[PDB]
Design a protein around this ligand. Structure first.
Ligand SMILES: [Cl-]
Ligand SMILES: [Cl-]
Ligand SMILES: [Cl-]
Ligand SMILES: [Cl-]
Ligand SMILES: [Cl-]
Ligand SMILES: [Cl-]
Ligand SMILES: [Cl-]
Ligand code: NA
Length: 129
């Protein structure tokens, strides 16, 4: 599914991401924009053989099982396929674990490089929330 900007802001708020670990909703919308362009079916293969899945491009080295990332973990206890669903529940619940890991949203390199310290409230401007 390709979400609209405000549609995704709403879904993320519905699932308790807004101000989760102190990160405002605009930070999460911005991260999703640059990770996936709001496409739940986004995938990206890394040089190490791991794969990133879904609207927040969650990686198979730690967070989900895809059966093809040797030595990896599955700390979200889900198949990586769950991260490609039109229903963002699995992505949001797994993102809550990731952002709790110690480095906050710096775990998403695209957030650090493209969203951190910018006027992220622009990402929810106009939205009925
Ligand atoms: Cl947009
Ligand atoms: Cl915000
Ligand atoms: Cl594996
Ligand atoms: Cl595990
Ligand atoms: Cl599995
Ligand atoms: Cl949803
Ligand atoms: Cl933090
Ligand atoms: Na894994």
């Amino acid at each position: 599914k390709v979400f609209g900007r405000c549609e995704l802001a709403a879904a993320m708020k519905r699932h308790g991401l807004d101000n989760y670990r102190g990160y405002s909703l605009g930070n999460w919308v911005c991260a999703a924009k640059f990770e996936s362009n709001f496409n739940t079916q986004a995938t990206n293969r890394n040089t190490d053989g791991s794969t990133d899945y879904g609207i927040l491009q969650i990686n198979s080295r730690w967070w989900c099982n895809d059966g093809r990332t040797p030595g990896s973990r599955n700390l979200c206890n889900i198949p990586c396929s769950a991260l490609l669903s039109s229903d963002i529940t699995a992505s949001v619940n797994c993102a809550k674990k990731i952002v709790s890991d110690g480095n906050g949203m710096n775990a998403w390199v695209a957030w650090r490089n493209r969203c951190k310290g910018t006027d992220v409230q622009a990402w929810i401007r106009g939205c009925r929330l």
